[PDB]
Each structure stands twice: as structure tokens, then as C-alpha cells.
Amino acid sequence: VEKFNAENYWKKKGLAMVPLKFPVGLGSRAAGQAAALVHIYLDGSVLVT
């Protein structure tokens, strides 16, 4: 990229690296609660929600 930029006046290249820390978590324990419902029918098949 430095080679290109020294050789080219009206076009330039650039390069960057960036690190990531994305913390995950809500305000409280109640905000992160969750629920489901599961039925098994007599033919063995399952309905979930």
C-alpha cells in the first residue's frame, strides 16, 4: 500500500486493523429470563414453542 501510494497520485490505497470486544448481558436477571412449552403427541412427534 505504501508502494502504491508513492507510485500513484490520483488513486490511493489504505489499510487498517481493528479489534473487537463485544460484551453480552442485559441489566438484570429478570430481563434475561426465558420460557418454552413442549408437547409430545402419542405418535411420538414434538411441538415446541
Binding site: 403427541y41 402419542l42 405418535d43
Partner: protein
């Protein structure tokens, strides 16, 4: 001893509504046994319950 007609004032009535996804049926029916309706319809369509 003679028989007897039920003579429920509401005659046999149903509305059968396909969802249009994964062969889902919703069956609205005047019945005493929803689970049996589920089974016979599912069986007929060759679908899991």
C-alpha cells in the same frame, strides 16, 4: 327399545384451514374429542401430529 337421535341444535359443523407452510392444518370443528380429530386428520394427510 328404540334408538334416539342426538338432535344437537347445532348440526355437524367444521372449518378446515391450511396454513400454507410445512403442510400445517388448523381444524375448527364442533367436536367432543379434539385429540381424535388431530389424529384422524394427521393420519389421512400422512403428517406428524
Amino acid at each position: 327399545m328404540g334408538g334416539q337421535e342426538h338432535f344437537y341444535m347445532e348440526t355437524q359443523s367444521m372449518l378446515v384451514v391450511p396454513k400454507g407452510e410445512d403442510q400445517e392444518m388448523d381444524v375448527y370443528v364442533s367436536t367432543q374429542f379434539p385429540k381424535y380429530i388431530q389424529d384422524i386428520v394427521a393420519s389421512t394427510l400422512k403428517l406428524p401430529a
